[PDB]
């Protein structure tokens, strides 16, 4: 939750390096944890970050699992995450089967 | 030839070997490993001027070769081979014109005179025309524009001419093999070891 808020701050601050470090550090705590929405929030940033770097396949998987978590919780981030999923499906060259 | 002592025939033939190799080829042709030790020990440093000539020839500079020919002129006239060194100078100019084919396609006569160091397009046109006639270069002259057009395409290897050439070259190899068969047979008849 703390890491999710830190990432949320650096998303508006636009500090990519830090977001990469924070997401890579958040992946360790995910091993032994309950099942909230947070697990799908960090992944959304993890997707955007992977688009900023150039890794489109990892962004596609991140946006897919994040969309699943946003489907389990609800809107409004679900539609935007689905838009970023289609964007990652096209940028991957080529997924061409999102729906 | 196997030798224990150095002979003047071997020295003069070695000097003339360097000269002819500088004329025919772009550099000095490597003598076989079975050549006499006295050649590399005595003949080589005795005819030092000739290896010095090849050393200046390798820099592709005509003015420096001219300076070296004027430097040891007495030694070259002493061996009575002055003329072959002039042919080496002319072959260095030819080599410098030949090197233009590898990089240029259409080159100006003035640019050639500047690069080869001939002074004037007139001498460049003379050299190119002589080289085309002697079959040394595969080029054409455009007087109107003052250009030289390098073609570099003698054959496409579809003529019967090549068929007859290959047939003759193969007959030479067959002749050589039959001679080697005769030598091998002659040895097989002789006593064992």
């Amino acid at each position: 939750e703390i890491y999710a808020l830190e990432i949320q701050m650096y998303t508006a601050q636009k500090n990519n390096k830090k977001l990469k470090a924070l997401y890579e550090q958040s992946l360790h705590i995910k091993s032994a944890i309950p099942h909230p929405l947070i697990m799908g929030v960090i992944r959304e940033c993890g997707g955007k970050m992977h688009l900023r770097e150039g890794e489109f396949e990892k962004a596609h998987t991140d946006f897919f699992e994040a969309f699943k978590n946003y489907d389990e919780s609800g809107s409004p981030r679900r539609t935007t995450c689905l838009k970023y999923l289609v964007l990652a499906n096209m940028l991957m060259k080529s997924g061409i089967n999102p729906f | 030839t196997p030798a224990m002592a150095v002979s003047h025939i071997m020295l003069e033939s070695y000097k003339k070997y360097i000269l002819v190799s500088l004329i025919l080829l772009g550099k000095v042709q490597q003598l076989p490993k079975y050549t006499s030790q006295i050649v590399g020990r005595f003949i080589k440093p005795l005819s030092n001027a000739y290896h010095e000539l090849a050393q200046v020839y390798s820099t592709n500079n005509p003015s420096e070769l001219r300076n070296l020919v004027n430097k040891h002129s007495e030694t070259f006239t002493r061996d009575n081979n002055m003329g072959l060194v002039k042919q080496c100078l002319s072959s260095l100019y030819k080599k410098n014109i030949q090197r233009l084919t590898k990089t240029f396609l259409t080159l100006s006569l003035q640019d050639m005179a500047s690069r080869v160091q001939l002074s004037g397009p007139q001498e460049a046109e003379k050299y190119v025309l002589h080289m085309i006639e002697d079959g040394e270069i595969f080029a054409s002259i455009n007087q109107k524009d003052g250009m030289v057009s390098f073609h570099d395409n003698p054959e496409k290897y579809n003529n019967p001419a090549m068929l007859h050439n290959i047939d003759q070259e193969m007959l030479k190899c067959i002749e050589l093999d039959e001679r080697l068969k005769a030598m091998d047979q002659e040895i097989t008849v002789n006593p064992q070891f």
């Binding site: - | 224990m4 079975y34 990089t103 240029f104 640019d111």
Partner: protein, 419 residues
């Protein structure tokens, strides 16, 4: 050699120790006008850590500089020098006493630590040879791998100032092989203490000094940004400059795309120096005009760097040549005026450069100097194969005739007698 874009303050703030001293002396020796500030900063830091020689060298050079400054239109502190000499000698006697005490007690940890402190103080005083001898003797008092790693890092640190790059590489590979091949996995989910980064940077500088730019870049590109501060060898901004230029000069398009551009580890370094990042990206985007413009803008500023300068000619020539190849690679027929304009040079100078590039390099073209067009040359496969085969047959026949006569002379025993 003049460039006012250099920021002496930040450049001095990034480094430390003899590295700071030698770099400030390099800026002072190679670049005038900025010599004054370089000498002032050098003197101020030479007074720290206690050093006499460096103070005498800098004071002599500052006095000659002040004489030149007075010719255009600090006083010798022998009391501090003698006090420093007395302080250094007495501290060396204290370290000798404690070292002999631990040697008498016979404790591996105490003797090894004593030799390490001894070596640090020898480095502070200004002894280039003895400082290595301390760690060389400290070698024998090791048990665990960690002690050997720290020792090797110290040996490498001193060997950089001694310019023994072969020993640097040897101790780098030694410190890489001793801890069960870098702890095998990576100390589980990465390590807080980045040792591999220091090893790749040291090996990178060693490969750079040995003029092996491809391996130098290959090591530098693998170094992670998490190490951050390292003033004993090289700063991350310079890691980006060194690695960036070396990779641009030696690596090809596919290698630059996979190991430099898509590299996440080096991306941060590319974010530190945007100029190098723009140069690499303009080189990959085929914008050679702006690439050479930025590269020539950097040239005079990079000429002042301590370790980078003796390669600045090679790198730039290697880059330019590669760019010329990358420019002509997709063309069958290219205009020499657009090429000369794209490479910031004249048509005749481009013609000379290209002629040299065809004579030895990767360019397989012919220059049409009349119309100023560079045409790509396509080798006729059949004619070349036939030509070299026919010539081989001729050479074979001549070798056969030669050995036929050799067989004849050896048979008839024809030879020149000695007397």
């Amino acid at each position: 050699v003049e460039n006012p874009s250099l920021d002496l303050e930040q450049y001095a703030a990034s480094y430390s120790g003899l590295m700071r001293i030698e770099r400030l002396q390099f800026i002072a020796d190679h670049c005038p006008t900025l010599r004054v500030e370089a000498l002032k900063m050098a003197l101020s830091f030479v007074q720290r850590t206690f050093n006499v020689d460096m103070y005498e060298e800098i004071h002599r050079k500052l006095s000659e500089a002040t004489r030149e400054l007075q010719n255009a239109p600090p006083a010798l502190d022998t009391a501090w020098v003698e006090a420093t000499r007395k302080k250094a000698l007495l501290k060396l006697e204290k370290l000798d006493t404690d070292l002999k005490n631990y040697k008498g007690n016979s404790i591996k940890e105490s003797i090894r630590r004593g030799h390490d402190d001894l070596g640090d103080h020898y480095l502070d005083c200004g002894d280039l040879s003895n400082a290595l001898k301390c760690y060389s003797r400290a070698r024998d008092y090791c048990t665990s791998a960690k002690h050997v790693i720290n020792m090797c890092l110290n040996v490498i640190k001193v060997s950089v100032y001694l310019q023994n790059w072969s020993h640097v590489l040897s101790y780098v590979s030694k410190a890489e092989s001793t801890p069960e091949i870098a702890e095998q996995r990576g100390e589980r989910d990465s390590q807080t203490q980045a040792i591999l980064t220091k090893l790749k940077c040291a090996a990178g500088l060693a490969e750079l000094a040995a003029r092996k730019y491809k391996q130098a870049a290959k090591c530098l590109l693998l170094a992670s940004f998490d190490h951050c501060d390292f003033p004993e060898l090289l700063s991350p901004s310079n890691v980006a400059i060194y690695g960036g230029l070396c990779a641009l000069a030696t690596f090809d398009r596919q290698e630059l795309q996979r190991n430099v551009i898509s590299s996440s580890s080096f991306k941060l370094f590319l974010e530190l120096e945007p100029q190098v990042r723009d140069i690499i990206f303009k080189f990959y985007e085929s914008k050679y005009a702006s690439c050479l413009k930025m590269l020539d803008e950097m040239k005079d500023n990079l000429l002042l760097d301590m370790y980078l300068a003796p390669h600045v000619r090679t790198l730039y020539t290697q880059i330019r040549n590669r760019a010329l190849i990358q420019y002509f690679s997709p063309y069958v027929s290219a205009d020499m005026h657009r090429m000369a304009a794209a490479f910031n040079t004249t048509v005749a100078a481009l013609e000379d450069e290209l002629t040299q590039l065809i004579l030895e390099g990767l360019i397989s073209a012919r220059v049409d100097s009349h119309s100023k067009i560079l045409y790509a040359r396509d080798v006729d496969q059949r004619s070349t194969t036939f030509e070299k085969s026919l010539l081989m047959g001729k050479e074979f026949q001549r070798r056969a005739k030669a050995m036929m006569l050799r067989a004849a002379v050896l048979r008839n025993q024809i030879h020149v007698k000695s007397p």
